[PDB]
Design brief:
It is classed as replication. The structure is cut from a larger assembly and holds chains A (63 residues), B (104 residues), C (424 residues), D (553 residues) and E (181 residues). Helices cover 23% and strands 11% of the residues of chain B. With 104 residues, chain B is an alpha+beta fold. Chain B has a domain of 54 residues. The longest helix of chain B has 16 residues. In chain C, a hairpin with an 8-residue loop joins strand 19 and strand 20. The longest helix of chain C has 25 residues.
Chain lengths: 63, 104, 424, 553, 181
C-alpha cells in the first residue's frame, strides 16, 4: 500500500539540485573564456547530479 | 510521450488508427495531461524515458537508417549517414528512444 | 674482495636473462637481453604524469639511477656515462670517465643540479647538469649511494678496516661535512640465497631518504634503521622503529613462513610501501604486483609468552608497552621538523595533535596496571612523562578509584611545579 | 619538420573540451592497411578521453560531398592517405583566413610521389614530415625557390632558361609511378613508442598492416625483418611457458607456408592452392594432377582424427615436409614455401597466425551484406566495411569463422573462371602488353567491387610468371556486369621471381592523365586508386590505339 | 509507468546500490571535488590508504592515474577457511561478505591485471562458492512452514532471484489456509 510522501526533505534538496546545476553552469563558461588543462573536476560533477536526478525520476513514476 | 515530433502519432496502424481515433481524444487527453506534468514539476526533471540506470560516461554508438540534420540543442552532432560516434552519456538518451541511433 | 657494481634496489639475473636495474617511488627500470644487444625498458607507476618510453642499448649499460627529472646510465668497464632528461628541451650529453687498470665504477647517483660518480679506487668526480667538471677528490671507496636534493650519502668499505658511512651537503659556498666516516651498525650475513650473496657482498637490499629529512637504510638483517637528529652530532643516533619478523607473525595468525619477504619501496609518514613476493626466489619476476602497505611496529615481544596466551593476537596490556615506544619516537621527530623546517603538506598539526593524544592515553593503561598491583612508587614515575595538562586530571580519577590517597597529592605537586616554570 | 611528439601534444590542446569541439578523422575502406592504422589511434583517444567522429569515404569524387558542405567548428580534421598525388588545396578552395591559422588538418599519406606545396608553403597542411624521407627531393632548394619570385634582355633571357632548367626537373618529377614505400603501421607505432605505451594488442595490431603488403611488394617489409624481431623480445612477457593460463595472450614464432590457412583448416583445399604454387612453377593443371599424387595422397585425409592429425600430428608431417623439402632444397631450390612468419595464441581457441588472418579480412570486406544503381551500390561497401572493423575483439568468434568458410569458396569461385579464360586463349600479346577482355562468362557479379580484381590479377600475373626473358609487362583486363558499359578497367604490376633492382612502379597513370585530357567523352576517374579507371564500350577500342603508340615507359 | 518489472528490481540497479559504498585505493596524482559528498583532498600522497567511494574510482581508473587495493578477504588463503565452516555445518551458511558476487564482477575489468597472481585461481575459488550457497538454498525451501522463515546470510543477488516466485506460492497457499476458517 502507499506510504506518506515525505515532502519536507524533498523540497529541501530540490533547491539543491537547482543550485549545483547553476554552479556548473558558470564555471564551465569561466573555463571556456580562460581557454586562450584539468578535465577531472568537470566530469565528476556532471555525472553526480544526474544520478541523484535519476533516482527521483523513478521515484515519482511508481507513485 | 514527446521526444521528437510528438503529434506525429500517425504512420501508425492505419486500420486501427481510425479505431483509436475515437480513443485519440482519450489518448491526447493523456498527452495534454502528460505535458503539464512535465511542466508542473518545479524543476526540470525528465519524465520522457531514461528508465535504465546509467553506468559509464563514454559509449561507442553507430548509426544507420537515418539522414538529415537533427539535434539543434546541446551542440549539433552533424549526423551524416553510417558513421559512428564516441560521445558522452546524457545526449543519446533522447535519440536511442527516438530510434535513430542503433547500437550501444 | 671483489668490487661488484651496485645499484639501488637492484635484483640479480638468477637463471633468467632479465633483471631490474633500479627501483624507487618514481618507477622501475629493467633490461631485456636479445640476440645481439641489450634493450632498456622504463616503466612508471604514474602513467598520467610522465610519458613511458624505451630505447635500444648498443653500448650495454649496467648501472642506473632514477630521480624526478631524468635518468642516468653508466658503464663500469669503459667509463662511458649518459644522462637522459625526460623533457625534450634539454639535450643529451656523453662523456668518458678515465679509469685505471682494474678500476670499475661501483655506484652512481644523480640530482638535477649535480652529478655524483663513485669508483672502486675511491675517486670522487663531480659534474653539474651540463657536464662541466668542478673538483676531483680522493676519498674512501664508495659502494652505495642515495640522494634527495642537495645531500650526498656514501657508504664506504675499504679492504682492511671498512664498514663506514659519510654524510655531506653540496652547498653554494663549499661542501660541508656533517659526519666524517662514522661506523655503520648494519649486520653482515654469517640456489636463490647463494647467487644473491655473490652479486651483493654486503647484503644491502635497498636504501633511500624519507619524506621528513631523515636517512633510511635497509640491510640484510631486515631491520628498518632510522637516523634521527642528523643536523646535530651530539644527539645523532639510529632508531630501529620497525621489525619485519614481528609484523608478519602478528598479521598471519601466529605462524612464520619462509617464502614471504618484504621488499621496501618508499615510506611516506604512515606506512612502508612493499611488494608481496611469493616463491622460491627472493627477487621478483614479471607479472604486475599490487603495492601493499604495512603498519609500523616496534620489535618488542617474547616468543614463549605469546604461545601461552593463545593470525596471532596480542592482548591489551602487552600492546600498551609497544604503543608507548612507538609514539615517543615519532612525536620527538615531528616536533623538531616543524620548529626548524616548518610545514611541508599543511596538515602536520592534526597529525601531531592525534599522536600526542594517543601517547598520553596509552600511558594511562600502564598507569592503571601499576595501581592494581599496589606499586605506588612505579605509578609516580609514570606521571612525570605526561605532556598535556588534561592528562594530569585524568590520573587523579584512576588513583581515587584504586583507593590510594597518598598518590593523589603527588600528582598535584607536579601540576604546581609546571605552572611555576611556565611563568619564568 | 614535424617532430612526432610535438603534433600529438599540439593536437591535444586544440580540441579537448567537453562540448562539440569535435575532431573528425577520415579513412578509405579500399585498403586493409588503411583500416588497422586507424583502429589503434582511436582506442588511445578513448583512454585519453576525447570526443570523436569517424566517417569512411570510399570514393575520391565523394570527398566534396562529405566535407565541403557540413562544417561548423571543426578545427582538427584528420585524414589517412588521400592526397599524395592530387593537390587537395587546388581540389578544395580554402581562402587564407585569420599565419597561426584557424583550422588545421594533418595528413598521413603513404605514397611515393609527393606534392611540394604540401610540405613547402605549409599553412593549413601540416603534413607528417619527420625522419621518413631525409632526401625529400633534395635538389629542390632552388627550383621552386626561384619560381616563387621569378641590359636585362640578355640577363633575364638566361634567367628564363634557368627557370626552364628548373622546369624540366619539375617535369621529370611529378611524372613517376607510385607505390607505398613505408606502411602507415610503421609511423604511428613508432610515435606511440616515443610516448611509451606497452600493450601486446598494439604489437599484435601493427604487424597486421605490414603483413598486408606482402602480396603487393617485396623489399618494403624486408627492411622490417629486424623490427619484428626486437619488439617481440623486448616485450617479452615471460621466460617460462607458465601453462594453463586462459588469458595473457602469449606471443611466439613458428615456421609457416605460402600454402596458407592450414592451421585453420582444409589440407583438402590446399590441393587447389598447392597447384597455385605449381602455377608458380610450370603448369596449372597437367603434370601436377599427376605430380601432386606423389606428395599428397600418401595419407588418406580423415573425418574425426583429422581434427587431430592435420591439427596435431601434422607436426610429424610438417617435420616430414621439413625433412622432405630439405632434400628438395639443393635439388629443387624453390624457396616460396619455407618462411619465418609470425603467430599468436589466445590461451585457448586454437592457434591463429597472421598469414591467414589478413586473408579473412579481405574476403569478409567483400561479401557479408539516372545513376540510381551506383548509389545503392556505394551504400553497400561502406556498410560491409563496418562489420570488419569490429572484428578485432574477442567478442567476434562465431562471425570470425564466417569469413573463413567464405574465403575457401571465393578462391574456388575465382579459380573456376581463371581456368576458363586460359583455355579460351584470349590473351593476345599485341606489341607491348597483353590484352584480355572478359566479355561474358558466368558469375559476373563478383567483379563490381575492385578488391577482388587485384586478386584476380594476382592470380593472373602468376600464370605468366615463368622465365619470360623478354617483355615483362603486366596486363590490362576488362569486365562488365551493369548498364552503359561501366567497365572498371585496371592495370597490374610486373613481377619478379625472387632475384627490385629495376625501378618498376607504373607507367599507366602517366598515360591515364593523357587520355583523360583528350576529349572528355564519357571517361571517369571517380574511383579512388589511380590503377583503376572506367571506360565506355566504344572508347576502349580507341583507348588501345592511343596506347600502342604512346610509349611512355 | 514501467509495467514490465515492478514487483522486483532489475539486475542493473542492484549494482547501483552497491556502487555507492566506499573502499580504499592507492592514489597517484596531486577545486578538485565539490560533488556534495566529496571530501576532496589537496595534492594527494601515494603509498597511503583513503576511504574513497567506488564509482568515481572506476572512472579514475579509465584515465589510469590511480591503483586499487583489494579488500582484505580477497586472497585465496582466506576463502578456504570459509569452506570448512560450512561443510561441517549443513544447517545454514556461516560467514558472509554480504555483497561478494556483484563485487567480483566489477573487479574483473582492469581491476584484475593489478593484483598478484589471481587468474586461474580466483574464478576457481568463487564459482564453487556460488553453488554451495545455492545447494544450501534448495534444501531450505523444501522445509517451508507457514509464514515464518529463517534466512540468515544471503547475498543481495539471490534475494533478487528467490523473490518473484517465493511470494505467490506462499501467498496462494495463504488463502486456502485462511479462507478455510
Amino acid at each position: 500500500e502507499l506510504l506518506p510522501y515525505p515532502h519536507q526533505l524533498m523540497k529541501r534538496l530540490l533547491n539543491r539540485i537547482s543550485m549545483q546545476s547553476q554552479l556548473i553552469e558558470n564555471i564551465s563558461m569561466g573555463f571556456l573564456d580562460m581557454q586562450n588543462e584539468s578535465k577531472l573536476p568537470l566530469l565528476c560533477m556532471e555525472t553526480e547530479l544526474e544520478r541523484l536526478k535519476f533516482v527521483i525520476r523513478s521515484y515519482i513514476r511508481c507513485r | 510521450n514527446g521526444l521528437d515530433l510528438m503529434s506525429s502519432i500517425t504512420f501508425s496502424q492505419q486500420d486501427t488508427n481510425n479505431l483509436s481515433h475515437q480513443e485519440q481524444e482519450y489518448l491526447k487527453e493523456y498527452c495534454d495531461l502528460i505535458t503539464d506534468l512535465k511542466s508542473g514539476d518545479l524543476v526540470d526533471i525528465d519524465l520522457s524515458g531514461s528508465l535504465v540506470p546509467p553506468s559509464d560516461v563514454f559509449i561507442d554508438v553507430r548509426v544507420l537508417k537515418d539522414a538529415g540534420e537533427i539535434q539543434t540543442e546541446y551542440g549539433v552532432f552533424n549526423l551524416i549517414k553510417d558513421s559512428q560516434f564516441f560521445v558522452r552519456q546524457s545526449d543519446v538518451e533522447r535519440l536511442i528512444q527516438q530510434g535513430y541511433l542503433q547500437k550501444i | 674482495f671483489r668490487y661488484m657494481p651496485f645499484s639501488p634496489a637492484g635484483t640479480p639475473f638468477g637463471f633468467t636473462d632479465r633483471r631490474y636495474l633500479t627501483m624507487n617511488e618514481v618507477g622501475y627500470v629493467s633490461t631485456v637481453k636479445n640476440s645481439e644487444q641489450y634493450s632498456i625498458t622504463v616503466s612508471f607507476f604514474d602513467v598520467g604524469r610522465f610519458r613511458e618510453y624505451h630505447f635500444e642499448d648498443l653500448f650495454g649499460y649496467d648501472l642506473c639511477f632514477l630521480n624526478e627529472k631524468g635518468t642516468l646510465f653508466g658503464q663500469s668497464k669503459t667509463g662511458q656515462i649518459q644522462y637522459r632528461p625526460h623533457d625534450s628541451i634539454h639535450s643529451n650529453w656523453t662523456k668518458i670517465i678515465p679509469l685505471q687498470a682494474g678500476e670499475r665504477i661501483t655506484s652512481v647517483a644523480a640530482t638535477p643540479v649535480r652529478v655524483i660518480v663513485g669508483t672502486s679506487l675511491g675517486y670522487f668526480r663531480s659534474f653539474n647538469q651540463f657536464g662541466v667538471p668542478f673538483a676531483v677528490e680522493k676519498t674512501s671507496p664508495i659502494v652505495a649511494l642515495t640522494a634527495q636534493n642537495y645531500r650526498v650519502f656514501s657508504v664506504h668499505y675499504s679492504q682492511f678496516h671498512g664498514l663506514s658511512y659519510s654524510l655531506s651537503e653540496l652547498g653554494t659556498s663549499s661542501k660541508r661535512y656533517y659526519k666524517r666516516e662514522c661506523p655503520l651498525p648494519m649486520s653482515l650475513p654469517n640456489d636463490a640465497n647463494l647467487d644473491y650473496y655473490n652479486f651483493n657482498p654486503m647484503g644491502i637490499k635497498s636504501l633511500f631518504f624519507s619524506s621528513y629529512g631523515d636517512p633510511c637504510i635497509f640491510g640484510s638483517d631486515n631491520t628498518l634503521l632510522l637516523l634521527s637528529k642528523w643536523r646535530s652530532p651530539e644527539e645523532s643516533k639510529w632508531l630501529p622503529i620497525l621489525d619485519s619478523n614481528m609484523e608478519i607473525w602478528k598479521m598471519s595468525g601466529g605462524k612464520e613462513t619462509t617464502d614471504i619477504h618484504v621488499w621496501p619501496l618508499a615510506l611516506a609518514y604512515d606506512t612502508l610501501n612493499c611488494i608481496l613476493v611469493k616463491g622460491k626466489h627472493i627477487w621478483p619476476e614479471f607479472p604486475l604486483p599490487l603495492p601493499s602497505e604495512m603498519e609500523i611496529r616496534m620489535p618488542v615481544f617474547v616468543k614463549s609468552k605469546l604461545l601461552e596466551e593463545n593470525e596471532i593476537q596480542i592482548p591489551v596490556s602487552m600492546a600498551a608497552e609497544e604503543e608507548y615506544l612507538r609514539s615517543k619516537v615519532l612525536s620527538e621527530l615531528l616536533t623538531d621538523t616543524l620548529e626548524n623546517d616548518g610545514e611541508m603538506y599543511g596538515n602536520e598539526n592534526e597529525v601531531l595533535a592525534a599522536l600526542n593524544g594517543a601517547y598520553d592515553k596509552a600511558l594511562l593503561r600502564l598507569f592503571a596496571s601499576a595501581c592494581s598491583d599496589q606499586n605506588v612508587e612505579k605509578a609516580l614515575s609514570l606521571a612525570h612523562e605526561l605532556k598535556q595538562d588534561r592528562a594530569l586530571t585524568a590520573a587523579v580519577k584512576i588513583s581515587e578509584r584504586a583507593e590510594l590517597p597518598s598518590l593523589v597529592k603527588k600528582i598535584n605537586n607536579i601540576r604546581e611545579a609546571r605552572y611555576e616554570q611556565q611563568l619564568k | 619538420i614535424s617532430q612526432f611528439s610535438e603534433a600529438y601534444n599540439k593536437i591535444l590542446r586544440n580540441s579537448s573540451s567537453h562540448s562539440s569541439c569535435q575532431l573528425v578523422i577520415f579513412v578509405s575502406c579500399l585498403n586493409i592497411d588503411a583500416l588497422c592504422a586507424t583502429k589503434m589511434l582511436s582506442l588511445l583517444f578513448k583512454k585519453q578521453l576525447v570526443q570523436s567522429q569517424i566517417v569512411p569515404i570510399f570514393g575520391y569524387s565523394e570527398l566534396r560531398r562529405h566535407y565541403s558542405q557540413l562544417d561548423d567548428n571543426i578545427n582538427s580534421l584528420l585524414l589517412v592517405g588521400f592526397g599524395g598525388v592530387i593537390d587537395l588545396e587546388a581540389f578544395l578552395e580554402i581562402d587564407p583566413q585569420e599565419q597561426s591559422f584557424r583550422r588545421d588538418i594533418y595528413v598521413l599519406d603513404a605514397h611515393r610521389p609527393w606534392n611540394l606545396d604540401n610540405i613547402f608553403g605549409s599553412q593549413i597542411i601540416q603534413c607528417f614530415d619527420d625522419g621518413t624521407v631525409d632526401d625529400t627531393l633534395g635538389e629542390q632548394k632552388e627550383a621552386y625557390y626561384k619560381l616563387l619570385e621569378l641590359n636585362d634582355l640578355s640577363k633575364r633571357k638566361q634567367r628564363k632558361k634557368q627557370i626552364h632548367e628548373y622546369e624540366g626537373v619539375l617535369e621529370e618529377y611529378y611524372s613517376q609511378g607510385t607505390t607505398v614505400v613505408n606502411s602507415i603501421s610503421a609511423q604511428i607505432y613508432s610515435l606511440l613508442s616515443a610516448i611509451g605505451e606497452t600493450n601486446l594488442s598494439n604489437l599484435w595490431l601493427n604487424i597486421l598492416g605490414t603483413t598486408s603488403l606482402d602480396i603487393a611488394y617485396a623489399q618494403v617489409y624486408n627492411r622490417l625483418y629486424p623490427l619484428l624481431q626486437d619488439e617481440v623480445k623486448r616485450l617479452t612477457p615471460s621466460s617460462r611457458n607458465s601453462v594453463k593460463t586462459p588469458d595473457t595472450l602469449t606471443l611466439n614464432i613458428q615456421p609457416d607456408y605460402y600454402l596458407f590457412l592450414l592451421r585453420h583448416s582444409s589440407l583438402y583445399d590446399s590441393f587447389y592452392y598447392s597447384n597455385y604454387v605449381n602455377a608458380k612453377l610450370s603448369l596449372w593443371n597437367e603434370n601436377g594432377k599427376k605430380r601432386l599424387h606423389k606428395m599428397f595422397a600418401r595419407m588418406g585425409i580423415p573425418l574425426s582424427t583429422a581434427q587431430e592429425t592435420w591439427l596435431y600430428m601434422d607436426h610429424s608431417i610438417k617435420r616430414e615436409l621439413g625433412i622432405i623439402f630439405d632434400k628438395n632444397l639443393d635439388r629443387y631450390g624453390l624457396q616460396d614455401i619455407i618462411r619465418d612468419g609470425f603467430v599468436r595464441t589466445l590461451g585457448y581457441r586454437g592457434s591463429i597466425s597472421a598469414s591467414e588472418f589478413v586473408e579473412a579480412l579481405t574476403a569478409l570486406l567483400e561479401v557479408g551484406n539516372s545513376a540510381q544503381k551506383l548509389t545503392n551500390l556505394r551504400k553497400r561497401w561502406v556498410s560491409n566495411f563496418w562489420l570488419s572493423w569490429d572484428a578485432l575483439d574477442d567478442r567476434k568468434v562465431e562471425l570470425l569463422n564466417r569469413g573463413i568458410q567464405l574465403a575457401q569458396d571465393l578462391q574456388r569461385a575465382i579459380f573456376n573462371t581463371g581456368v576458363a579464360i586460359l583455355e579460351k586463349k584470349l590473351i593476345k600479346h599485341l606489341r607491348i602488353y597483353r590484352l584480355c577482355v572478359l566479355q561474358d562468362g558466368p558469375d559476373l557479379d563478383l567483379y563490381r567491387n575492385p578488391l577482388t580484381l587485384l586478386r584476380l590479377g594476382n592470380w593472373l600475373i602468376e600464370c605468366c610468371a615463368e622465365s619470360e626473358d623478354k617483355q615483362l609487362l603486366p596486363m590490362v583486363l576488362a569486365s562488365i556486369d551493369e548498364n552503359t558499359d561501366t567497365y572498371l578497367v585496371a592495370g597490374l604490376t610486373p613481377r619478379y621471381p625472387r632475384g627490385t633492382k629495376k625501378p618498376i612502379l607504373n607507367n599507366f597513370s602517366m598515360a591515364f592523365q593523357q587520355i583523360t585530357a583528350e576529349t572528355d567523352a564519357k571517361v571517369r576517374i571517380d574511383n579512388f586508386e589511380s590503377s583503376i579507371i572506367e571506360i565506355r564500350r566504344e572508347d576502349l577500342s580507341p583507348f588501345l590505339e592511343k596506347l600502342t603508340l604512346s610509349g611512355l615507359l | 509507468l514501467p509495467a514490465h518489472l515492478q514487483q522486483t528490481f532489475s539486475p542493473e540497479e542492484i549494482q547501483f546500490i552497491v556502487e555507492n559504498e566506499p573502499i580504499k585505493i592507492f592514489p597517484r596524482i596531486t577545486w578538485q571535488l565539490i560533488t556534495t559528498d566529496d571530501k576532496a583532498l589537496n595534492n594527494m600522497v601515494a603509498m597511503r590508504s583513503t576511504e574513497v567511494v567506488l564509482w568515481i574510482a572506476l572512472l579514475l581508473k579509465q584515465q589510469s592515474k590511480c591503483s586499487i587495493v583489494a579488500p582484505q578477504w580477497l586472497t585465496t588463503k582466506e576463502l578456504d577457511r570459509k569452506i570448512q565452516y560450512e561443510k561441517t555445518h549443513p544447517d545454514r551458511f556461516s560467514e558472509l561478505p554480504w555483497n561478494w558476487l556483484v563485487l567480483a564482477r566489477i573487479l574483473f575489468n582492469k581491476a584484475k591485471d593489478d593484483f598478484h597472481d589471481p587468474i586461474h585461481e580466483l574464478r576457481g575459488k568463487i564459482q564453487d562458492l556460488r553453488e554451495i550457497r545455492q545447494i544450501k538454498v534448495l534444501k531450505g525451501l523444501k522445509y517451508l512452514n507457514e509464514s515464518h522463515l529463517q534466512l540468515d546470510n544471503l547475498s543481495l543477488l539471490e534475494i533478487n532471484e528467490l523473490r518473484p516466485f517465493i511470494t505467490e506460492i506462499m501467498d496462494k497457499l495463504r488463502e486456502i489456509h485462511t479462507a478455510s476458517l
